[PDB]
Amino acid sequence: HTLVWGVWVNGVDQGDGRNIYIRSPPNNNPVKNLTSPDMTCNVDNRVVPKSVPVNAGDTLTFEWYHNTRDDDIIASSHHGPIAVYIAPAASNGQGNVWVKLFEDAYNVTNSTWAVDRLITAHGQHSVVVPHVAPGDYLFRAEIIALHEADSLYSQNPIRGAQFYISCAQITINSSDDSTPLPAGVPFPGAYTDSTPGIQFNIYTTPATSYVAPPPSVWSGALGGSIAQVGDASLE
């Protein structure tokens, strides 16, 4: 159970984005229905009045929270992967438009899930803004909590993988458009019951054998990380 408070750009807090530049849902409940339009940008997908200005090569940091800013972030039970996608705003996230900029599942060295490291990072994970065409974009941050993903939601609606999905309105101003955005996947549509990483047993299957849902990270992606960039507590 987690939500996006706002974003930082190059380590500078852009301020509370809820219902302003984040298409916030009313609460931190998960999405579970893989076929639902809610898979696109969660249960209240509508244009919000601001879009955060960034340039290609900027660090865009999502900041997540549980109940209040910089709290426990997400229950430590919620082991799973984190991904960030991008699509042009003109799409409203419809069609084969979502391009993957970031994937993190299990780190074998530290023996930690992406979610474990997100808590340690005070809810902060980042992507570097790619050299796409200047214009308006949606950045879709996705946390998958796997603590009930031994079942499929489609088969048993009180279990299944849990999706924490947040769409940020991002305006890319300065960019040479040297890596134009390639073809995307649909949400809903890319994740199905057979997709690797949707149905998984974190209790019996070694985390080392976990494979995150495709698609793969775009070669044009400029980097990203799960790591605190800024101290919320100093504001």
- 193 in Cβ contact with 151 (< 8 Å): no
Amino acid in the structure at residue 40: T
Q: Smaller CB distance to ligand NAG: residue 37 or 220?
A: 37
Binding Cl ion by CB under 5 A: which of 10, 11, 12, 16? 16
* Structure-token match 């996230």, residue found: 93
Query: Closest distance between ligand NAG and the C-beta of residue 154, in Å?
Result: 8
Query: Closest distance between ligand NAG and the C-beta of residue 36, in Å?
Result: 4
Q: Is 164 annotated as a binding residue?
A: yes
**98, 156, 130: which is closest to 220 by C-alpha?**
130
Q: Is 58 annotated as a binding residue?
A: yes
* Binder of residue 157, out of ligand NAG, Cu ion, Cl ion, none (CB less than 5 to 8 A by kind): ligand NAG
**116, 109, 76: which is closest to 226 by C-alpha?**
116
Q: Rule CB under 5 A: is residue 135 a binding residue for Cl ion?
A: no
* Binder of residue 110, out of ligand NAG, Cl ion, Cu ion, none (CB less than 5 to 8 A by kind): none
Q: Is residue 15 classed exposed, middle or buried when 0-12, 13-18 and 19+ CB atoms within 10 A define those classes?
A: middle
- 153 in Cβ contact with 36 (< 8 Å): no
Binding Cl ion by CB under 5 A: which of 31, 149, 212, 226? 31
Query: Which residues in the 164-193 window bind Cl ion by CB under 5 A?
Result: 188-189
**29, 193, 23, 162: which is closest to 93 by C-alpha?**
23
Binding Cu ion by CB under 5 A: which of 1, 69, 117, 159? 1
Degrees, nearest 5: CA angle 72-65-235: 100
Q: Is 129 annotated as a binding residue?
A: yes
Give the CA count within 13 Å in the CB-facing half-sphere of 109.
Answer: 1
Contact footprint for Cl ion (CB under 5 A):
15-16, 31-33, 35, 126, 188-189, 224-225
| Bind-site residues | 1, 9, 47-48, 58, 67, 78, 129, 140, 147, 162, 164
Contact residues toward Cu ion (CB under 5 A) are 1
